[PDB]
Structure 1
Amino acid sequence: MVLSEGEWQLVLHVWAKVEADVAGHGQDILIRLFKSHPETLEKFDRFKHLKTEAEMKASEDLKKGGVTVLTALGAILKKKGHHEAELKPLAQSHATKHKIPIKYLEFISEAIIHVLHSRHPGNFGADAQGAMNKALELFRKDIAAKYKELGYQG
Structure 2
Amino acid sequence: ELSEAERKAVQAMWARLYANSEDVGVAILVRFFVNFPSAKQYFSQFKHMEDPLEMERSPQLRKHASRVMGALNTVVENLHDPDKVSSVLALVGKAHALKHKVEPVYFKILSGVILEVVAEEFASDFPPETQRAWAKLRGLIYSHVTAAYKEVGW
Give TM-score, length-normalised by structure 2: 0.91
How is 1:69-84 mapped onto 2 (pairs within 5 angstroms)? 69-80=68-79, 81-82=82-83, 83-84=85-86
**Which of 98, 104, 118 pairs up with 1:116?**
118
1 CA distance for matches of 2:132 and 2:31? 20
Q: Which amino acid aligns with 1:93?
A: A
RMSD: 1.3
2:101 maps to which of 77, 99, 102: 99
Match of 2:136 among 134, 137, 143: 134
Instruction: State the shift of 1:77 in Å.
Output: 2.0
Counterpart CA distance in 2 for 1:47 and 1:130 is 34
Identity across the alignment (%): 30
> In the alignment, which residue of structure 1 is the partner of 2:25?
26
Q: How many residues align?
A: 151
Instruction: List runs of 5+ in structure 2 lacking aligned partners.
Output: none
Quote how far apart the aligned CAs of 1:87 are. 2.3
Distance in 2 (CA, whole Å) between partners of 1:116 and 1:88 is 25
Distance 2:133 2:66 in 1: 22
1:120 to partner: Cα distance? 1.0
Match of 2:45, SS?
Answer: coil
* TM-score between the two structures when normalised by the length of structure 1: 0.91
Displacement over 2 Å in runs of 4+: none
- Check conservation: 1:23, 1:64, Cα contact below 8 A: no
CA displacement, residues 15-67 of structure 1 (integer Å, 9 cap, x when unaligned): 01011111101101001111221110111112112121111112233122201
